[PDB]
Structure 1
Amino acid sequence: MENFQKVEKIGEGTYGVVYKARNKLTGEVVALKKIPSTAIREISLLKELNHPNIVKLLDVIHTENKLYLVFEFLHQDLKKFMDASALTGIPLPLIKSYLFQLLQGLAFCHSHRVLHRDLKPQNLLINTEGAIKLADFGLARAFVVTLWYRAPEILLGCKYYSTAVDIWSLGCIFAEMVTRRALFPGDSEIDQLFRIFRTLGTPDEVVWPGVTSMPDYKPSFPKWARQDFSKVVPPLDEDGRSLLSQMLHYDPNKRISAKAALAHPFFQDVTKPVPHLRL
């Protein structure tokens, strides 16, 4: 860490704290995260996971039984941009571009069976070029935090969940980009699940085989009718509703995979517009 001058505290987490920082040697501006043993082999292997849509891990520094991950630095995150554009809302060609690239990113990690596990708008970093990247990828396998984006399999006690959880999270963020409100803003675990249920219907065994046998499934969960996406994300168009729908599927094995969403007719006219930032 002695090769770094900390320019500014740019955030906070549960793993540790993040600082903008200038490399005494290279001059590079980087983001420094200040955070045992198989954490190192798991972190060092993500260093080999490079993609235009993943915030690049530049270096991992092990000293004093403290760990530091120097990442490439992007100036803004999605949550900040979203609060910034609350009165007009992100234009749809820009939402669609953001979504396309994010799914490209996830298409890549998911190939390697790496998953993010904790996507939320504060982990998605954007630049004035109109690019958007995933930050904190793979940090979870190693090693108030919101549940807003948590897939219901995780909420219901699945130990061994899959890449589909990232597709669930992405769907929630996509709904939020379009509507300008979080889709399922739970304040605790059961309110989170019960919010999911109120919109998309309590899952049963017809929509989700095996739902009733999961650890934290109770037969006594209330039973809500499903609602129409025409009421959930107006005025997103039918391609968008169709896509969103497939990304919020209860059955993790029926949920659309990133690779497959990429071929959806929603992205048929996808472009690459540049944001109006002020970062």
Structure 2
Amino acid sequence: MENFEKIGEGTYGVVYKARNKLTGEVVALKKIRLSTAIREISLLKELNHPNIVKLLDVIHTENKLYLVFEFLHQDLKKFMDASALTGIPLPLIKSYLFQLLQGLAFCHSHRVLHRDLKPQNLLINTEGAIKLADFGLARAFVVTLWYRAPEILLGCKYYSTAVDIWSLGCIFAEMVTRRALFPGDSEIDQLFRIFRTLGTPDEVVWPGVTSMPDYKPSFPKWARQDFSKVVPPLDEDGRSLLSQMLHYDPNKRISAKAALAHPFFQDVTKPVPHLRL
């Protein structure tokens, strides 16, 4: 009431659409009901890029943290559902993947990881842009497992930039096929869905995997499927890029900067989506 409608529930709290009393601007206010996290989150006010949802302010009051963001009108999950009968056109999938890779390459260059990328934290506007929301929040602080990289599911506690490339690969596949790639409903179901598609990992494709905290020698041994079966009708360039984003070994997975130079983006453009708001 001093300085200012519910949108829904997010990973760290409730998000509201609100009007700033001093400026008249419409913003998204995220209330995180609860000192190290305050300094860390406050530093993200400097992590500004056209493909990163702007964090305007970080307020600590009455033992609660409020994050004030730029407001966007739709998320990618709602846009994919709106497009379920025809699919998103390939040039717009390409544009959105390219823009998300630019946003990741910027954050990764500043050593900031997301760790929890998913369609609900990718927001779009009427000008053809897509933006990443919530970078840096996981480090400072049902939850979907569908986009979680296999090193996280296998108990590695040292995250690298590769976890975000894996999640983006999963989202890319879901834009093309109109279905989630690995819709697990438990940690083991998530792992076994990844293993049934990509094959059970072993020391040949992922050195050190058998020494991971949650690796079990008793995991079933599935053979790998071809990407031509997984994401039809994506062309050879797109399937090659997806295969590099879903390598098991996080050291082998393509970086966001290298992905921007992939042949799949030779003809990239920026189409304008028709949005129904």
TM-score (norm 2): 0.98
Q: Deviations over 1:51-72 (max 9, x none)?
A: 0000000011111111101000
Question: 1:14: how far off?
Answer: 3.4
CA–CA separation in structure 2 for the residues paired with 1:65 and 1:275:
41
Question: 1:143: how far off?
Answer: 1.3
CA–CA separation in structure 2 for the residues paired with 1:42 and 1:162:
18
CA–CA separation in structure 1 for the residues paired with 2:248 and 2:76:
26
| Number of the residue aligned with 1:213 | 211
| Number of the residue aligned with 1:16 | 13
Unaligned runs of 5+ in 2: none
CA–CA separation in structure 2 for the residues paired with 1:14 and 1:72:
18
| Number of the residue aligned with 2:110 | 112
CA–CA separation in structure 1 for the residues paired with 2:239 and 2:8:
34
Question: 1:161: how far off?
Answer: 1.7
Secondary structure (helix, strand or coil) at the match of 1:107 reads helix
Q: Deviations over 1:233-262 (max 9, x none)?
A: 000000000000000000000000000000
Question: 1:154: how far off?
Answer: 0.2
Identical amino acids, percent of aligned pairs: 100
CA–CA separation in structure 1 for the residues paired with 2:212 and 2:111:
23
Question: 1:128: how far off?
Answer: 0.6
Root mean square deviation, CA, Å: 0.6
Q: Deviations over 1:103-141 (max 9, x none)?
A: 000000001110000000000000010000000111111
| Number of the residue aligned with 1:146 | 144
Secondary structure (helix, strand or coil) at the match of 1:140 reads helix
Q: Deviations over 1:12-36 (max 9, x none)?
A: 123110000001110000000001x
Secondary structure (helix, strand or coil) at the match of 1:205 reads coil
* Shift >2 Å, 4+ stretches: none
Question: 1:273: how far off?
Answer: 0.2
Question: 1:193: how far off?
Answer: 0.3
CA–CA separation in structure 2 for the residues paired with 1:161 and 1:127:
30
| Number of the residue aligned with 1:225 | 223
Q: Deviations over 1:36-87 (max 9, x none)?
A: x000110011111000000000011111111101000000000000001000
| Number of the residue aligned with 2:27 | 30
Secondary structure (helix, strand or coil) at the match of 2:6 reads strand
CA–CA separation in structure 2 for the residues paired with 1:178 and 1:33:
31
| Number of the residue aligned with 2:135 | 137
CA–CA separation in structure 1 for the residues paired with 2:86 and 2:141:
40
Question: 1:268: how far off?
Answer: 0.3
Secondary structure (helix, strand or coil) at the match of 1:272 reads coil
Secondary structure (helix, strand or coil) at the match of 1:59 reads strand
Secondary structure (helix, strand or coil) at the match of 1:95 reads helix
TM-score (norm 1): 0.98
| Number of the residue aligned with 2:59 | 61
